[PDB]
Amino acid sequence: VTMLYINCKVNGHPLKAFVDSGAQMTIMSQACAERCNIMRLVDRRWAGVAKGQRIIGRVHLAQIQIEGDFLQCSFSILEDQPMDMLLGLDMLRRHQCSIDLKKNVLVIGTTGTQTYFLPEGELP
Amino acid sequence: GSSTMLYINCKVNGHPLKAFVDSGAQMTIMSQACAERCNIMRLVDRRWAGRIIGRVHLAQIQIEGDFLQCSFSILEDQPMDMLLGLDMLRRHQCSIDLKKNVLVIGTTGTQTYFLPEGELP
């Protein structure tokens, strides 16, 4: 069973995001926020400790680029989250997305943009 | 700033339950308590025991009027009755459609609504 990931970019930097309808919150790792050069967007007011783990702060409505579309998304930054990016139900709802396992695509409902889930050999 | 989850109605062996729809989970898992309530303990193959009690190789999960052939493991003390994971979502070519607010079974076209907050288990 191949897990669901998509390609996306933040501030022009490519990453692979895990698509998890069972997660309430979208979360980027601190390492990925550094690589994407977006620490200036990290509001440390919203620092805390996640379940399971320091949340370093929160990014408000930054653009996540999927194919050629730019979608405004908020997400928190977790220290030492192994994976770069976890796209949770908050985001999937915001943008009225469909996870379509027949076509093997994530559809962004607000735009009609469609992106293929990565094949097994491309998963991180 | 910060710091409704997806559920559907379904039935197993005629008994209703609410399933958590989790595309980040590899495996579909029913609680032992639910397996007992649905009266399907006879289907549990305990050679797959770990805590996972065993595996149900074949059971019908009913969604609306659809009967879908599924496999799932049985977990002692899982809080929710069923976690519907990517194995079964992929098997039945499902769409999780958050614009329409439905789970679509791709093999039949059947749709079921995600439950509102007040109906969550």
From Swiss-Prot, chain B:
Function as written in the Swiss-Prot or TrEMBL entry: Probable aspartic protease. Seems to act as a proteasomal shuttle which links the proteasome and replication fork proteins like RTF2. Required, with DDI2, for cellular survival following replication stress. Together or redudantly with DDI2, removes RTF2 from stalled forks to allow cell cycle progression after replication stress and maintains genome integrity.
Family: Belongs to the DDI1 family.
Catalytic site: 22
UniProt entry tagged with the keyword Hydrolase: yes
Annotated GO biological process: cellular response to hydroxyurea; proteasomal protein catabolic process; regulation of DNA stability; regulation of protein stability
A GO molecular-function annotation: aspartic-type endopeptidase activity
Source superkingdom: Eukaryota
Coiled-coil segments: none
The protein, known as: Protein DDI1 homolog 1
Keyword line: Aspartyl protease, Hydrolase, Protease
